[PDB]
């Protein structure tokens, strides 16, 4: 759908009012299916590795998050439609310039292609960016055709600050999701009992990201 209208008339007001925005049927069945095949090819060729945490301590990462992931730039052979998804996400964000809170969004991470391989895997309650590493917006695309959350689980539960209800997001095929990455939106991925795929991109605030890079380049 046209990026300008979607961004300014739905995403921006929804994010500023609620900090969470769901766009269903983002790319259509055909494109969503091609993305799914590309993700399943990465899975089938051994590209995924255990999901990792910002700060690693005595504990195992699998006690925290049970997914396996790979990072995709978008230009790799066999990832062309993932690149199209990424470009489509970027297009929406560019049309939001200066309208999402006070942030100045000039960059993003690579795409995290993520798989919870059933077996009850999930992600304990967490904040995506609790310590100011530059991430301001989390963007997720789901590609689980035939997902029945009542049996297979995998619901993303967000606890938006200051709300009388939490937000339950089923990992529905062709669903696009935005939410603030900071402490306003603690969230958890509830156990998945079937193979669950998503693609995650984080968008950076320029000023916060610059401060985070300074801290990294000077030894914290």
């Amino acid at each position: 759908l046209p990026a300008l209208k979607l961004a300014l008339e739905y995403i921006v007001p929804c994010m500023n009012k609620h900090g969470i925005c769901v766009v269903d049927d983002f790319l259509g069945k055909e494109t969503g299916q091609q993305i799914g095949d590309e993700v399943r090819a990465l899975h089938d060729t051994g590209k995924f590795t255990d999901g990792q945490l910002v700060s690693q301590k005595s504990d195992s990462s699998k006690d925290i998050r049970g997914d396996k992931i790979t990072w995709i730039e978008g230009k790799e052979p066999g990832c062309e439609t993932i690149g199209l998804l990424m470009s489509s996400m970027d297009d929406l964000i560019r049309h939001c310039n200066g309208k999402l809170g006070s942030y100045k969004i000039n960059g993003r991470t690579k795409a995290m292609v993520a798989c919870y391989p059933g077996n009850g895997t999930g992600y304990v309650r967490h904040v995506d960016n609790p310590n100011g590493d530059g991430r301001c917006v989390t963007c997720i695309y789901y590609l689980n055709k035939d997902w029945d959350a009542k049996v297979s689980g995998g619901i993303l539960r967000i606890f938006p600050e200051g709300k009388a209800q939490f937000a339950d997001i089923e990992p529905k095929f062709d669903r696009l999701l935005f939410f603030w990455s900071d402490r306003r939106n603690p969230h958890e991925v509830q156990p998945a009992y079937a193979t669950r795929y998503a693609i995650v991109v984080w968008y950076f605030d320029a000023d916060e990201r610059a401060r985070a890079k300074v801290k990294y380049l000077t030894g914290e």
Binding site: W71, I105, T109, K110, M112, V124, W202, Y216
Partner: peptide
């Protein structure tokens, strides 16, 4: 309190930022 960075999903901190 808990150090929430021990639960936060990892991202590369240098050399992998995409410019829009």
């Amino acid at each position: 309190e808990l150090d929430l960075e021990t639960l936060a999903p990892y991202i590369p901190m240098d050399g992998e930022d995409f410019q829009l």
